[PDB]
Amino acid sequence: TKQITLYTATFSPYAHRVRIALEEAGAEYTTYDVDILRNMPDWFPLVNPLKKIPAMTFGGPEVPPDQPSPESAKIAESLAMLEFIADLFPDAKLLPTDPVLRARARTFMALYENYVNGQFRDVWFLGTPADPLLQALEMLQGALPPDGGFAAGEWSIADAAVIPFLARMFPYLEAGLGLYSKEDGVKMRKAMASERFARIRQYVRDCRARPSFANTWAGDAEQVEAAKTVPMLRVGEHHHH
Amino acid sequence: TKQITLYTATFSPYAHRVRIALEEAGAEYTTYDVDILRNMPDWFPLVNPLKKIPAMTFGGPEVPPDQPSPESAKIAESLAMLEFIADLFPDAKLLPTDPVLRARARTFMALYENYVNGQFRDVWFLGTPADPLLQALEMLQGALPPDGGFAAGEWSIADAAVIPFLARMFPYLEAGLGLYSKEDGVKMRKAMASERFARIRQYVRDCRARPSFANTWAGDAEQVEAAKTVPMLRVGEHHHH
Numbered sequence: 001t002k003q004i005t006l007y008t009a010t011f012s013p014y015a016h017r018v019r020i021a022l023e024e025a026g027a028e029y030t031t032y033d034v035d036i037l038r039n040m041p042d043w044f045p046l047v048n049p050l051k052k053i054p055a056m057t058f059g060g061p062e063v064p065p066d067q068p069s070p071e072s073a074k075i076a077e078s079l080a081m082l083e084f085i086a087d088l089f090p091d092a093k094l095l096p097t098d099p100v101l102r103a104r105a106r107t108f109m110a111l112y113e114n115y116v117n118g119q120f121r122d123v124w125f126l127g128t129p130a131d132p133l134l135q136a137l138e139m140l141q142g143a144l145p146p147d148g149g150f151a152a153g154e155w156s157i158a159d160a161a162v163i164p165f166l167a168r169m170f171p172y173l174e175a176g177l178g179l180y181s182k183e184d185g186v187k188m189r190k191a192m193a194s195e196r197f198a199r200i201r202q203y204v205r206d207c208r209a210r211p212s213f214a215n216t217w218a219g220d221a222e223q224v225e226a227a228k229t230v231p232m233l234r235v236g237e238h239h240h241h
Numbered sequence: 242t243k244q245i246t247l248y249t250a251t252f253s254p255y256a257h258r259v260r261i262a263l264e265e266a267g268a269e270y271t272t273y274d275v276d277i278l279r280n281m282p283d284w285f286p287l288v289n290p291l292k293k294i295p296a297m298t299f300g301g302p303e304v305p306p307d308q309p310s311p312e313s314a315k316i317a318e319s320l321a322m323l324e325f326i327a328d329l330f331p332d333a334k335l336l337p338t339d340p341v342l343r344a345r346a347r348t349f350m351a352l353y354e355n356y357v358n359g360q361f362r363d364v365w366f367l368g369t370p371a372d373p374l375l376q377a378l379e380m381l382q383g384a385l386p387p388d389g390g391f392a393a394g395e396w397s398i399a400d401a402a403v404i405p406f407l408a409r410m411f412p413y414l415e416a417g418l419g420l421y422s423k424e425d426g427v428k429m430r431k432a433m434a435s436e437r438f439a440r441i442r443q444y445v446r447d448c449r450a451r452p453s454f455a456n457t458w459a460g461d462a463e464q465v466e467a468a469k470t471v472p473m474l475r476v477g478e479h480h481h482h
């Protein structure tokens with residue numbers, strides 16, 4: 001009964017996480033785009049004082065999203081929102097019930113956030129060498145069940161946390177978007193197509209095939225165009241060596 | 242009933258996080274120290290392929306910790322362990338039951354891990370400027386309930402996650418541990434004693450007063466000595482800006 005509003009942006013893989021989870025929960029919710037990196041509305045700090053997307057309001061009176069209510073709960077940080085949606089919709093089984101399988105899901109989320117995300121950031125925003133990123137991706141791939149399935153076996157919020165980033169990698173590379181050089185762009189594209197990374201390719205296909213991805217994805221070319229609006233992706237710019 | 246073994250090290254605030262939660266859970270468990278930074282045992286990758294402390298084994302036959310069983314579940318990443326202990330011991334109420342209050346706990350953990358922890362790392366190990374760390378700490382302080390209490394009201398695993406790091410700050414500063422300059426040491430000691438940080442001081446006192454802290458802390462002087470065994474805290478080195 002309590003309303004959910006997700007403040008979103010098409011380029012934001014963090015917001016994408018939460019859209020995927022809300023779809024998997026079968027939740028009723030509103031999305032509201034915010035041009036957070038170029039033209040933040042003056043009211044936005046009322047829903048998130050950190051001034052980041054995603055932001056979520058929960059409950060309170062129904063109001064237009066650009067007139068947030070002080071009575072709604074203000075929830076920040078995408079992974080906290082993922083666990084929140086699992087808590088709100090237990091019958092949707094967005095986590096396993098078995099403690100050890102739940103821990104696989106939490107561990108996978110931590111592996112991505114602690115060791116992989118920053119490597120994506122270094123390569124895409126600074127143009128540092130790709131090898132440490134490929135190494136981190138091989139580590140993450142190693143945590144998947146080798147014979148198939150999602151991070152914790154059945155689909156869980158762990159896969160909502162990770163697919164937005166992995167799914168952007170291939171189309172961004174194909175467009176040459178990011179501060180890495182052509183040489184590293186080619187090296188990454190080759191690596192990600194090689195048998196070294198067959199398992200994570202299967203993982204990306206399996207996550208993308210679910211309705212929760214299809215219904216929250218603009219299309220590869222459309223996502224690339226939204227990403228080009230990101231100031232620190234510096235479209236047209238590349239660092240070398 | 243299944244066995245819990247936590248591979249530990251006194252200097253590791255990440256391991257401290259999990260000892261606190263296990264104490265709060267009233268769990269039966271074994272700890273085993275690992276000299277992970279100076280002399281990793283050859284068997285240690287069997288309990289954590291990432292080669293980090295903490296590591297946890299769960300279940301399997303009862304064996305000496307230096308003879309780990311292939312049959313035990315291997316759990317990595319301290320925050321995943323915190324959630325696992327909450328899942329294993331629901332009657333200990335290591336999280337709230339209310340979804341919004343649970344979200345406060347998850348958000349607080351994310352705020353620390355995403356915005357504060359890296360500033361502690363960069364100030365202590367690289368000697369980067371202290372002001373961004375103090376800014377991040379003011380942000381974290383602002384997430385606390387203003388009138389007292391823990392991150393989500395009642396004590397929760399969010400407080401296990403954060404106190405190891407905040408509790409080390411004061412004695413480390415007083416002992417001059419870290420690669421930051423003299424000027425930034427003075428600045429941080431003055432700030433952390435100023436009215437600006439009264440709320441987080443009460444928070445640290447409130448967390449330290451619980452038996453779960455007292456029974457897992459070696460003492461301030463002892464923790465300082467353990468931290469001096471960390472190789473990248475190179476004695477006699479300071480960075481300046």
Ligand SMILES: CCCCCCSC[C@H](NC(=O)CC[C@H]([NH3+])C(=O)O)C(=O)NCC(=O)O
Nearest residue numbers: 012013014036051052053054077078079355
């Ligand atoms: C490949 C494109 C990546 C684009 C940047 C990431 S999406 C927008 C970005 N959001 C975040 O940084 C949120 C991270 C936060 N830790 C979470 O998990 O929700 C933001 O609002 N940033 C504004 C700010 O940090 O001030």
Ligand SMILES: CCCCCCSC[C@H](NC(=O)CC[C@H]([NH3+])C(=O)O)C(=O)NCC(=O)O
Nearest residue numbers: 118120121124125165168169172232355356
């Ligand atoms: C193919 C996928 C490419 C993924 C690129 C990385 S985007 C995520 C990146 N986030 C971080 O680096 C972590 C920031 C911070 N520690 C947090 O947890 O919010 C970011 O928002 N960075 C914003 C910036 O660096 O400008």
Ligand SMILES: CCCCCCSC[C@H](NC(=O)CC[C@H]([NH3+])C(=O)O)C(=O)NCC(=O)O
Nearest residue numbers: 114252253255277293294295318319320468
């Ligand atoms: C107060 C002293 C300063 C802190 C020292 C770091 S603690 C030991 C360190 N552990 C980690 O980095 C664990 C991080 C992991 N993300 C977690 O949450 O468990 C380790 O084993 N490192 C070995 C490695 O990374 O290879």
Ligand SMILES: [Ca+2]
Nearest residue numbers: 382383384385
């Ligand atoms: Ca506040």
